[PDB]
Subunit: 210 residues, 2 copies
């Protein structure tokens, strides 16, 4: 048995998204719907065609008849951006069958410039003869930044690592850039700087030894 | 009904991987196992405790005895690297329930436990009436960790965000977790802790408010 979903559905916030799940006489079967965000397990949102489990807002509803079932998401929020899979039991094969999933994109969420917080090496770190600067980059949308570091206005490339942005519980992104140096290097400069570029705008913070 | 899986299992090529799926008398549910690779739908690899769909290698075997179901992958290959989810029927809620998933890494380099560096809010941030702690987690492989925070002795959930690990230029993984507080909150506790779990290993670092330098 084969279940066919559109690979992709786009919806603007507050509007309604429809996720079709096509199968031959799927209306005779019982449809389950799953929401899955990257790195997490699938969460059940609708079951038995149109029932919601506990904690699922009733703007999630389903329908099923003929050759087509559908998940409808009313009043779409950024938090609904995810993969949705329809699942049915198939008596002939004697086990579950999944659709290939639909990635729901919420178009046009508000852009948000990152908050940049630059930390000097910790006391526990310097007393251990180590030093690390961390540039925390949070609350930005969309999820792409560039980071550049300077030591006393001179650019620093070696020793720099920046994580790939990932989505936080508020549906904005976070990343961190960090710079490994020696306690001697740290103290031998007047200041260090972290500059973040987001959507053609730049935010730079500076830190100096106390 | 709750299914508990280990968040990560790692195995060298050609060795055996065991993925547990614990539940209270799970031995009397019928456990299905899914394999999921990045950007793909789940793929059934084992159904009804131990039955294989058509075309799954016999390296994959399921068992389901008492409090423990397990998926065993023998003579592991690189292509086995995936997320694995167990799933049972629970008509005490009357729908399927999933375990939290297990990241299986096929080891391509030495295991490395994470370096954990915990940063307090700077004096400068606190003067601007903000307070953020950052737990920097670096140089680890496989790329999966779980982070837990405490305020004095008390678990903290509010204000915590943790990034998904990402492969850095040295080919090991890094992530960070951060806790947003007010300065008043920060100064009202004697310590905060970040605890990082990496497979079997756990490291906890603590920091304390100080009245300055």
């Amino acid at each position: 048995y084969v279940l066919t979903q559109p690979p992709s559905v786009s919806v603007a916030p507050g509007k309604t998204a429809r996720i079709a799940c096509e199968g031959n006489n799927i209306g005779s079967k019982s449809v389950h719907w799953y929401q899955q965000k990257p790195g997490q397990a699938p969460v059940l949102v609708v079951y038995d065609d149109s029932d919601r489990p506990s904690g699922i807002p009733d703007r999630f509803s389903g329908s099923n008849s003929g050759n087509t079932a559908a998940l409808t998401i009313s009043r779409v929020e950024a938090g609904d951006e995810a993969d949705y899979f329809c699942q049915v039991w198939d008596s002939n094969s004697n086990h579950q069958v999944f659709g290939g999933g639909t990635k729901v994109t919420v178009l046009g969420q508000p852009k948000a410039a990152p908050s940049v917080t630059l930390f000097p090496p910790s006391s526990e770190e310097l007393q251990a003869n180590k030093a690390t600067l961390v540039c925390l980059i949070s609350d930005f949308y969309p999820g792409a930044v560039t980071v550049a570091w300077k030591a006393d206005s001179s650019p620093v490339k070696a020793g720099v690592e920046t994580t790939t942005p990932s989505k936080q519980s508020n549906n904005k992104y976070a990343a961190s850039s960090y710079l490994s140096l020696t306690p001697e290097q740290w103290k031998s400069h007047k200041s260090y700087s972290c500059q973040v570029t987001h959507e053609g705008s730049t935010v730079e913070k500076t830190v100096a030894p106390t």
